[PDB]
Write a protein that binds this DNA or RNA. Structure first.
Ligand SMILES: Nc1ncnc2c1ncn2[C@@H]1O[C@H](COP(=O)(O)OP(=O)(O)OP(O)(O)=S)[C@@H](O)[C@H]1O
Ligand SMILES: Nc1ncnc2c1ncn2[C@@H]1O[C@H](COP(=O)(O)OP(=O)(O)OP(O)(O)=S)[C@@H](O)[C@H]1O
Ligand SMILES: Nc1ncnc2c1ncn2[C@@H]1O[C@H](COP(=O)(O)OP(=O)(O)OP(O)(O)=S)[C@@H](O)[C@H]1O
Ligand SMILES: Nc1nc2c(ncn2[C@@H]2O[C@H](COP(=O)(O)OP(=O)(O)O)[C@@H](O)[C@H]2O)c(=O)[nH]1
Ligand SMILES: [Mg+2]
Ligand SMILES: [Mg+2]
Ligand SMILES: [Mg+2]
Lengths: 332, 330, 318, 257, 352
DNA sequence: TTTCGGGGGGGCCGGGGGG
DNA sequence: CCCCCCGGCCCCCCCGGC
């Protein structure tokens, strides 16, 4: 509707609306007739469709009515301590499946089991997972488990063994362009050629970010009211991408090799609010794909960029990390 | 359960019911069978990695000893139940100190996943085990021995469950393919065994997914391509091409090749790193420094990936690490 | 099939103080106390499976004869031993009036006393002091430091040492003779080597063999009993070349099913107890092992991490 | 509906449930054309509770096909506490049911309370555990048994029952002392309800835990007398007779060692 | 009232710098019924909270500025009693969960959810008495939230988007986890230019009738603020008060006490490099930390003051910046800040 | 100092039983 | 109708390696 953001408005309603996860969606659709759904472990990068996929699977399995009494959803917003796992989850798994109605039986497959969805399971402690092990194993006849996570390494090995793994691939301009184009057409968004491809390249595997950026660009165009196609320049501006002139200036200052000049330029640059991650990514793209650098230089710069990115991922100070990275590059 | 066994996941549908259906643990199975057949069952400690057949083995042993009604003649406790010091003091002691209800016999207590129990409960269990040995025996199952107190380990006979050998996995796969009307090629079986890492759960889950992937399972044979598609794992040819490009091409060509290989099938960098590490393990390097640098840098990259981060930077880091490490061969 | 047979550990549990091997001086002292009575408050300490509970029970039985039922109060970790229990039940038992020969006293046996809380130990003090004329206390523990100093001051310290290879061989041969077990010298050597001074484990493995293979030779013993993984980890850490370390890790530890957390913890312990290596080098190796352990606890329990740990250790030792 | 069983007052069912709610947690009811047979086992697997309620106890009972309902006793008690004791109580179930409906109806007013309790998947058999020819069988007023059990439990956590020719002995040995109660068979025509009867084939001697007997004696509120059947190598059977049914406790004796 | 607060604009049309951002905010507020969750990131003191309030005033009425403070109870698993101060208006609620430290998660799992799971009674401007609009929750210092609280925010942001919209403000997106950034529309808030700061200061001076010899004085204040407009206004007020409301070309630039202490520490470190100097530096660090000076701020200012020393060479500065990066990472992952600060000072002393 | 979980020990409160 | 016994929450405090 008009009162919902595009990300929620265009959330897939059925398994056929998932864009580029066929390697798992095909098996999930097969289970509709097979009726032997195994324990599932969905994992992948942010905004790939895991939650949408499980919700659509439940929708198609039980229908709008029977779903509520057949699904138990727990996420990071709910307490999931060892006691909760040992009592509430166990009690729900021990219950008999709710009786389907005639409507449900004649119109939906109605498999003879219920589903417990532990979304964001990577946030659960190891003790809770250990408690879940035998709960899932014992009552498989009437219950099936779905664990959704971003970092699969956070799931204890026994649980990963018990579950069938599904890796959700990153969504890029090659496999997700169709969905973005469909959304743009349904929203009557006018864009220049390559704008959607640029959006998907900037999002870097996250379709939610791409849809949000498209909505922001559409809002800007509507406010302007000029009846002109959205260009890639404003798309880059909305995404926080540093202008190429600024990147070239930074590269030139680094090539100069003077500590004071680099420090002054970085101090001026940090006042614009550019995110350190975007700057590091752009510098990596510029340096790795440049032919005017030797193998040794690229070998060193790759490790320098990796170290800076790892440090930034820990929530450090952007100014200090960026200055250190630029100084180290200038000394190569 | 509900409906029938055909609705169960394959990992559960094929759970062994007798000791003759447990594969790959011949020594342990033979020893335990001899123990039960001669009335000399000691306290048991089954230590092993995931999906090796410990729970199945103990359940089958209990079924053999007590028959179908074994569920009502044994006391099974796992991490899903409360096993505090009070539980040990009251419930376990009462069970071990009392006679059977349904039929005469000795008492069996199965402390599955005993590595998740507190130290106080383990200490309380010592004299319970020692005092009621005449009529009760204890079996404890573990994946991590460091979590079990030395006193408890001293009281139990240890049986180690090795990772499943390849021939046992082939036999189980043959049985499954006989039950499920499926056709599997030798290359597909080789890839499945390679990726299983000695876990039967992985074998069964991947086989079920492969069957679901086939358009016409009755007359369609699972090939290595099907396995790699369902599992989303790199093909060996892709790993070899990536490694050859990294070790024999310029930086731009290596970057292009890595990007193309990853984009063609949407592979994850972590799987590529694992495959390259496996390939390089067999390489005969002339200098220890090369191996040291490879191992350290690749471990750092894997740890960084475990926490997320930029994927392109991580791929470039892998390329640079391999190049720098191999530059030491000279 | 439904009739269990008594394990040899319980079947051949020494019933007299003369059947206990090891700690000759302390055992003879206990025999002298039994002969002459006047047992003092005592604390027996040691490591698992050396004969502490057996010694205490044998001493109590020999001292009290047929009055064992009324004169002995046994409490262990499996029983509730809180402050209220100490104040009520133990105090009542100490205050009880019982007729015994001139040289005998009532005995309170607090097995696994290290698990008792500080408050109960505090409450036991004046009970021990005031009623010593009729009651005596025997504690058995694995870690003496858990017992508070006031209680240790009131007791006689008996720190049992590990059984030598000779004592283990003697007891094993006695059991073999009483059971008519076919064996070879190499089989006994393997059993004692794997026992690591633990009598209980030695007897358990000896029964497992014969119960499963009849003849106790080194081979048959090693088809069920695995060589202690601490020794394999020590060999891995002391290997001269990194290739040898990695080969040991792959073949003897990873391919056998040992978990990464177990391997890293064992590496920590072994490095802590490597007397032949300089302390600073050991500290650096411990730092590297701690890094690897922290990574493993986060969830990255991969063979690559252990290989990197070995590579860093070899880098340190060069 | 598949199954419909009416109690004139909810009090009877509440008292029946209260008789064994403190010893077991999960119960399984099998309802047929002959009535309701329920079984439950304690966590320690030392006590078994078997309840039988005949069709005569219901104002109106109808059960077309046998139905099995596995439930948790604490939830059932919580639900029952929500209904008044003076209202008719109807248990309703359907084919392959997923829940049991409790209907509290007050004929005085138009107040109807519907409570749905979700069933749990429990696949188990009753095994019809009952030994053919017990070594000894006695019966005596429930008040005397309860008094003896309460008196002896204060001295020890274990109670020994010995049956010999015209002699029933309850013994307890503890830290502060010991107690022994000896009773002989006797019959009084003036008040036969106070008589105790015994029939003995072989002498018996069995030890039991005090806590389990303390739980068992709670069933004295359902019957004025209690029957104890004792046999070596078999669990002791304590039976309280209802108007048209029974409540049985099978207690495993302690190992003699 | 202070000039910094007395002259804060209260509407989008009243903004005076970063006109492009103002146009973007107007475009976002044009059709607010489908406004996504917003995350404004930018340097401190630039006007992020002012712009958020202006956006809310553009969406709702001026009533967004009629604020009131309430106190909310919370109970932990151990029965500990915690208080949270909530600033609320008839249209939005403002919260700073980081005030409860590691307990912030509870606020996300109890308070926010409670707002998003229920409707509200609106007896003003609504005929039926029930609100027909989504409620806005501002989360201040969102970068201070623990990972558990951020994880808890995830499904709450999606399930109840029809009833709740979140507007978060931060000085750096590095501590924000990837899913939360993916769930938000990111808005960069650049610092005002020197000329814009000078214009604002000149307007304030004209309004306050402050005698100014030359406008360059304002310019001198603008550079000293390093793009921080709040600092600029407060420094202007302090300078005016320190010169009888009459500023001259020689009016010295006033620096805060903690900055002076950090500069003195830098001078001490440069001059003296010894263990006793390290002990004195530890005492100074303890004094700074005991008076609510964040450790990260201390490390940043000390690093930049050291890098501003003219007597140091390039190698020393490179070593200093490398150590600063390493120990900033250490601080991000540690509890005792004094330990990491002392380690950094010792490493710098060794390098010099 | 302290971000859970377990364990122990004390103080109330209240159901039930007895007089 | 009132008093006493003794089960169950409820709360507070203290470890947590070999
Ligand atoms: N495969 C997809 N197909 C279509 N839309 C998608 C897809 N993936 C993500 N989206 C879009 O992005 C929105 C969010 O998708 P999600 O299912 O929430 O992704 P997610 O992987 O569950 O996010 P995380 O792991 O909790 S950060 C959807 O409502 C869709 O609008
Ligand atoms: N030796 C085996 N032979 C046949 N199937 C096996 C074997 N081991 C594991 N499986 C299969 O994998 C499933 C799980 O086996 P489990 O007995 O649960 O392994 P486990 O070692 O007890 O798991 P952990 O240690 O609690 S993670 C079984 O139902 C079997 O289908
Ligand atoms: N010195 C010994 N001589 C003969 N048998 C021994 C000896 N020590 C232990 N055993 C045997 O091992 C069994 C157990 O001995 P224990 O007395 O329980 O050892 P423990 O040191 O008290 O164990 P802990 O400290 O509670 S783990 C005995 O029944 C004996 O059969
Ligand atoms: N004249 C004018 N003053 C502004 C503007 N934006 C911010 N300010 C002033 O700068 C002060 C600090 O702004 P604030 O939003 O609190 O900083 P932040 O939240 O850390 O980004 C405010 O008190 C305002 O007085 C603006 O657009 N025009
Ligand atoms: Mg999701
Ligand atoms: Mg198992
Ligand atoms: Mg002992």
């Amino acid at each position: 509707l008009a009162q919902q953001p595009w990300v929620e408005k265009y959330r897939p309603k059925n398994l056929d609306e998932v864009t580029a996860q066929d390697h798992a969606v095909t098996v999930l659709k097969k289970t509709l007739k097979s009726a032997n759904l195994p324990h599932m472990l969905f994992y992948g990068p942010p905004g790939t469709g895991k939650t949408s996929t499980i919700l659509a699977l439940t929708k198609e399995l039980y229908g709008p009515d029977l779903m509520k009494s057949r699904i138990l959803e727990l996420n990071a917003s709910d307490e999931r301590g060892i006691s909760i796992v040992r009592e509430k989850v166990k009690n729900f798994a021990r219950l008999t499946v709710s009786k389907p109605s005639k409507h449900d039986l004649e119109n939906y497959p109605c498999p003879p089991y219920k589903i417990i969805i532990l979304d964001e399971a990577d946030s659960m402690t190891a003790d809770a997972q250990s408690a879940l092990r035998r709960t899932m194993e014992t009552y498989s006849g009437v219950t099936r488990f779905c664990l959704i996570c971003n970092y699969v390494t956070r799931i204890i090995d026994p649980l990963a063994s018990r579950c069938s793994k599904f890796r959700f691939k990153a969504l890029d301009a090659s496999n997700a362009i169709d969905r973005l184009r469909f959304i743009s057409e349904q929203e009557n968004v006018k864009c220049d050629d390559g704008v959607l491809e640029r959006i998907l390249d900037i999002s870097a595997g996250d379709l939610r970010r791409g849809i949000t950026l498209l909505q922001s660009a559409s809002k800007g165009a509507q406010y302007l009211g000029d009846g002109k196609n959205i260009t890639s320049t404003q798309v880059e501006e909305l995404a926080g991408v540093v202008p190429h002139d600024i990147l070239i200036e930074i590269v030139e200052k680094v090539k100069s090799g003077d500590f004071d000049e680099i420090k002054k330029y970085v101090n001026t640059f940090m006042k614009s609010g550019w995110s350190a991650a975007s700057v590091v990514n752009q510098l990596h793209e510029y340096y790795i794909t440049n032919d005017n650098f030797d193998t040794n230089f690229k070998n060193q710069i790759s490790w320098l960029l990796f170290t800076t990115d790892s440090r930034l991922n820990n929530g450090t100070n952007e100014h200090i990390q960026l200055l250190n990275l630029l100084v180290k590059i200038s000394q190569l | 359960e509900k409906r029938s066994k055909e609705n169960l996941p394959w990992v559960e549908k094929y759970r062994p019911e007798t000791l003759d259906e447990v594969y790959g643990q011949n020594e342990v199975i033979t020893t335990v069978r001899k123990f039960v057949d001669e009335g000399k069952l000691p306290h048991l400690l089954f230590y092993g990695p995931p999906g090796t057949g410990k729970t199945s083995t103990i359940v089958a042993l209990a079924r053999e000893i007590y028959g179908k009604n074994y569920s009502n003649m044994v006391l099974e406790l796992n991490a899903s139940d409360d096993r505090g010091i009070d539980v040990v003091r009251n419930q376990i002691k009462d069970f071990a100190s009392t006679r059977q209800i349904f039929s005469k016999g000795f008492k069996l207590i199965i402390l599955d996943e005993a590595d998740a129990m507190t130290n106080a409960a383990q200490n309380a269990l010592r004299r319970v085990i020692e005092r009621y040995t005449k009529n009760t025996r204890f079996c404890v199952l573990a994946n991590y021995a460091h979590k079990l107190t030395p006193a408890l380990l001293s009281r139990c006979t240890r049986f180690r469950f090795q990772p499943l050998p390849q021939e046992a996995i082939e036999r189980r796969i043959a049985n499954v393919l006989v039950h499920e009307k499926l056709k599997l090629s030798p290359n597909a079986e080789k890839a499945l065994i390679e990726l299983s890492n000695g876990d039967m759960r992985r074998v069964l889950n991947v086989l079920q997914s492969c069957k679901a992937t086939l358009d016409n399972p009755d007359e369609d044979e699972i090939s290595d391509d099907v396995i790699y598609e369902c599992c989303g794992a790199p093909r060996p040819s892709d790993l070899k091409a990536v490694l050859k490009s990294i070790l024999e091409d310029d930086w731009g060509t290596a970057h292009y090749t890595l990007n193309k290989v990853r984009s063609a099938k949407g592979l994850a960098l972590i799987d590529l790193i694992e495959g390259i590490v496996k390939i390089l393990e067999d390489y005969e390097l002339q200098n220890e420094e090369t191996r040291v640098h490879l191992l350290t840098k690749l471990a750092d990259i894997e740890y960084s990936i475990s926490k997320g981060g930029n994927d392109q930077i991580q791929g470039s880091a892998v390329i640079g690490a391999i190049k720098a490490s191999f530059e030491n061969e000279t | 099939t439904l009739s269990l047979q008594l394990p040899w550990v319980e079947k051949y549990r020494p019933q007299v103080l003369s059947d206990i091997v090891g700690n000759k001086e302390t055992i003879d002292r206990l025999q002298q106390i039994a002969k002459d009575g006047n047992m003092p408050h005592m604390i027996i300490s040691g490591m698992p499976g050396i004969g502490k509970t057996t010694s205490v029970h044998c001493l109590a039985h020999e001292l009290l004869g047929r009055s064992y039922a009324d004169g002995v109060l046994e409490l262990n970790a499996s029983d509730d031993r809180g402050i209220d229990v100490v104040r009520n039940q133990i105090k009542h038992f100490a205050q009880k009036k019982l007729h015994l020969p001139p040289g005998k006293h009532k005995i309170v046996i607090l097995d696994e006393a290290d698990s008792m809380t500080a408050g109960a130990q505090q409450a036991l003090r004046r009970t021990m002091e005031l009623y010593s004329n009729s009651t005596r206390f025997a504690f058995a523990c694995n870690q003496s430091n858990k017992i508070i100093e006031p209680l240790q001051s009131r007791c006689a310290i008996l720190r049992y040492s590990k059984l030598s290879d000779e004592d283990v061989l003697k007891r094993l041969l006695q059991i073999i003779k009483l059971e008519d077990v076919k064996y070879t010298n190499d089989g006994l050597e393997a059993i004692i080597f794997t026992a690591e001074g633990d009598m209980r484990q030695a007897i358990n493995n000896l029964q497992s063999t014969v119960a499963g293979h009849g003849l106790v030779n080194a081979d048959n013993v090693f088809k069920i009993v695995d060589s202690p993984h601490p020794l394999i980890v020590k060999k891995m850490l002391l290997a001269s070349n990194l290739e040898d370390s990695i080969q040991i890790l792959r073949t003897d530890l990873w391919k056998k099913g040992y978990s990464s957390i177990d391997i890293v913890t064992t590496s920590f312990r072994v490095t802590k107890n490597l007397a032949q290596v300089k302390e600073s080098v050991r500290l650096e190796m411990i730092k590297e092992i701690g890094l690897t352990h922290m990574r493993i606890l986060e969830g990255v329990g991969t063979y690559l991490q252990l290989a990197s740990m070995l590579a860093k250790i070899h880098k340190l030792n060069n | 509906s598949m199954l419909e069983a009416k109690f004139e007052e909810a009090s009877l069912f509440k008292r029946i449930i209260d008789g064994f709610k403190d010893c077991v947690q999960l119960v399984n009811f099998q309802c047929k054309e002959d009535g309701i047979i329920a079984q439950a086992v304690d966590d320690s697997r030392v006590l078994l509770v078997s309840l039988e309620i005949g069709v005569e106890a219901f104002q109106e009972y109808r059960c077309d096909h046998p139905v099995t309902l596995g439930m948790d006793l604490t939830s059932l008690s919580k639900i029952l506490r929500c209904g008044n004791n003076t209202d008719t109580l109807t248990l309703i179930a359907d084919n392959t049911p997923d829940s049991i409906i409790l209907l509290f109806e007050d004929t005085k007013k138009d107040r109807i309370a519907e409570y749905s309790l979700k069933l749990m998947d429990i696949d188990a058999d009753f095994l019809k555990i009952e030994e053919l020819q017990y070594d000894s069988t006695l019966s005596l007023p429930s008040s005397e048994f309860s008094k003896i059990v309460r008196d002896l439990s204060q001295l020890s956590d274990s109670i020994n029952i010995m049956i010999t020719k015209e002699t029933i002995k309850f013994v307890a040995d503890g830290d502060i002392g010991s107690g022994s109660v000896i009773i002989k068979p006797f019959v009084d025509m003036e008040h036969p309800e106070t008589s105790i009867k015994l029939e003995m084939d072989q002498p018996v001697d069995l030890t039991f835990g005090a806590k389990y007997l303390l739980d068992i004696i709670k069933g004295s509120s359902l019957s004025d007398r209690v029957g104890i059947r004792l046999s070596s190598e078999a669990p002791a059977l304590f039976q309280f007779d209802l108007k048209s049914g029974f409540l049985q406790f099978f207690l495993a004796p302690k190992f003699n060692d | 009232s202070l000039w910094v607060d007395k002259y804060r604009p209260k509407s989008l049309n009243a903004l005076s710098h970063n006109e492009e951002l103002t146009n973007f905010l107007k475009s976002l507020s044009d059709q607010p019924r489908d406004l996504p969750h917003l995350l404004l990131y930018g340097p401190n003191g630039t006007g992020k909270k002012t712009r958020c309030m202006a956006l809310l005033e553009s969406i709702f009425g001026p009533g967004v500025y009629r604020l009131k403070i309430d106190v909310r109870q919370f109970v932990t698993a151990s029965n500990r009693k915690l208080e949270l101060n909530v600033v609320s208006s008839p249209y939005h609620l403002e919260i700073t969960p980081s005030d409860m430290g590691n307990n912030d998660r509870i606020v996300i799992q109890e308070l926010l959810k409670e707002v998003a799971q229920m409707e509200q009674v609106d007896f003003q401007d609504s005929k039926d008495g029930l609100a027909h609009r989504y409620k806005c929750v501002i989360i201040n210092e969102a970068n201070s939230l623990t990972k558990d609280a951020q994880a808890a925010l995830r499904r709450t942001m999606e399930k109840y988007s029809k009833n709740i919209r979140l507007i978060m403000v931060c000085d750096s997106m590095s501590p924000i986890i990837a899913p939360i950034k993916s769930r938000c529309l990111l808005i960069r808030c650049p610092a005002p230019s020197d000329s814009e700061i000078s214009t604002i200061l000149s307007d304030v001076v004209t309004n306050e009738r402050i005698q100014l010899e030359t406008k360059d004085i304002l310019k001198r204040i603008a550079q000293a603020s390093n793009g921080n407009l709040r600092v600029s206004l407060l420094m202007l007020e302090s300078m005016a008060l320190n010169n009888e409301l009459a500023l001259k070309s020689s009016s010295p630039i006033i620096k805060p006490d903690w900055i002076i202490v950090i500069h003195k520490l830098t001078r001490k470190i440069v001059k003296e490099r010894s263990v006793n100097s390290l002990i004195e530096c530890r005492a100074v660090l303890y004094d700074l930390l005991a008076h609510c000076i964040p450790a990260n701020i201390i490390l940043k200012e000390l690093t930049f003051s050291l890098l501003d020393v003219e007597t140091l060479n390039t190698t020393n500065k490179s070593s200093i910046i490398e150590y600063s990066s390493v120990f900033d990472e250490r601080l991000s992952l540690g509890n005792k800040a004094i330990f990491h600060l002392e380690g950094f000072i010792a490493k710098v002393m060794c390098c010099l």
